[PDB]
Amino acid sequence: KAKVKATLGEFDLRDYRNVEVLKRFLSETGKILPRRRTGLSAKEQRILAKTIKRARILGLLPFTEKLVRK
């Protein structure tokens, strides 16, 4: 499988308002993807987590979703 950072551009990791890119880092559910799937580094994932939680409080990124399978 491809990874997120691999298939992307030059983006702002601290911008909580850009949802179109922050949508790519969420799974089917509202969960934050592990590092093995984002292709980020240690310092990068720590910022991504905090900026995703910000976008959640602004009603932009969902806390949880519903899996359509099984």
């Binding site: 949880t64 519903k66 899996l67 359509v68 399978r69 099984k70």
Partner: protein, 116 residues
């Protein structure tokens, strides 16, 4: 007496029992069934045979009000959670979609000693 012909179905699967509710697109229920509704009484309620029969009893009850198209909602892990779904596709009800909405908390309440 309702003529709904479309709606949702909620499968509440536990280790001790599996129970089915059939509703309309708004969330209000029409009929339902469970492992105790059919003859099974004890631990036989949380068995896949029970989950299957419980599903098909509710499915025929929904035929009375005329259900044809059905959406599926599943909550909980337990024996027969899949036997209920497999029973639901071949129940005659055309199954529209199948969603797992099992509620998981963000670690808010302290569980009983059993779950730790």
């Amino acid at each position: 007496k309702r003529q709904v012909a479309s709606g949702r179905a909620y499968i509440h699967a536990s280790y001790n029992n599996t129970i089915v509710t059939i509703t309309d697109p708004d969330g209000n229920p029409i009929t339902w069934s469970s492992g105790g509704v059919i003859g099974y009484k004890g631990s036989r309620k949380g068995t896949p045979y029970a989950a299957q029969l419980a599903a098909l009893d509710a499915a025929k009850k929904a035929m009375a009000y005329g259900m044809q198209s059905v959406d599926v909602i599943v909550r909980g892990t337990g024996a027969g959670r899949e036997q209920a779904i497999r029973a639901l596709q071949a129940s005659g009800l055309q199954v529209k979609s199948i969603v797992d909405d099992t509620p998981v908390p963000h670690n808010g309440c302290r569980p009983k000693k059993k779950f730790r």
